[PDB]
Amino acid sequence: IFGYDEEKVNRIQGDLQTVDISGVSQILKAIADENRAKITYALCQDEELCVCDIANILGVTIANASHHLRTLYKQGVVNFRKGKLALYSLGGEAIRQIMMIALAHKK
Amino acid sequence: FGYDEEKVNRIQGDLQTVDISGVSQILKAIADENRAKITYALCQDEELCVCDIANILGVTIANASHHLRTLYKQGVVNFRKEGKLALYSLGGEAIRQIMMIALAHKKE
Ligand code: NA
Numbered sequence: 395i396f397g398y399d400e401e402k403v404n405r406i407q408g409d410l411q412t413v414d415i416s417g418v419s420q421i422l423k424a425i426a427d428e429n430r431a432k433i434t435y436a437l438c439q440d441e442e443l444c445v446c447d448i449a450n451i452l453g454v455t456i457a458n459a460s461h462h463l464r465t466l467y468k469q470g471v472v473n474f475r476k477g478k479l480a481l482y483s484l485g486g487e488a489i490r491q492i493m494m495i496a497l498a499h500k501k
Numbered sequence: 502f503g504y505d506e507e508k509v510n511r512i513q514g515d516l517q518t519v520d521i522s523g524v525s526q527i528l529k530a531i532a533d534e535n536r537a538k539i540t541y542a543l544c545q546d547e548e549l550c551v552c553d554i555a556n557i558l559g560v561t562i563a564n565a566s567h568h569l570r571t572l573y574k575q576g577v578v579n580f581r582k583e584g585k586l587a588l589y590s591l592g593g594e595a596i597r598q599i600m601m602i603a604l605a606h607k608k609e
Pocket residue numbers: 449450451453454
């Protein structure tokens with residue numbers, strides 16, 4: 395080879411082709427946002443919140459809050475379930491891990 | 502009065518004791534696709550150099566060095582120099598787990 399550690403590079407490139415690295419940047423980008431991360435975190439502490447709790451927790455308009463929640467929802471960071479009113483919860487125990495490990499690391 | 506004030510207030514109080522800001526900085530570091538690739542590739546080998554990394558990404562050495570600088574300022578990678586070989590490894594097991602849990606959650 396006229397190259398550089400080609401065997402290793404080939405094999406790690408083959409590993410990368412096995413996983414959805416595009417999809418992980420999407421999910422981490424959803425969570426990383428300042429207000430989104432505040433949301434995810436609140437949902438770690440209480441099971442369900444409505445959008446107005448979230449507007450008021452963050453100190454943002456409801457339109458701001460719905461936007462953030464939609465973003466979260468599409469990536470599976472959050473669940474919902476609609477009397478007239480949407481209740482929101484963590485999209486899975488995975489998401490509690492992500493935040494709580496993240497938390498623990500920066501310590 | 503206003504809306505759900507004491508519950509809002511409670512929760513604002515949790516949030517204030519926690520470094521949400523720093524978490525958001527870490528995930529932002531990891532979340533860019535090329536950096537997310539460098540991150541994942543360091544979950545596979547204990548150590549890699551800037552050259553393995555450019556070659557795995559198919560990028561210039563300069564362009565790998567800049568994403569690695571960005572990863573390293575956030576704690577996401579460490580290195581040990583070798584004499585002009587800079588050898589990166591993950592910044593901690595926590596970084597393996599965020600990536601791996603996010604990948605497996607995306608599988609569902
Ligand atoms: Na408010």
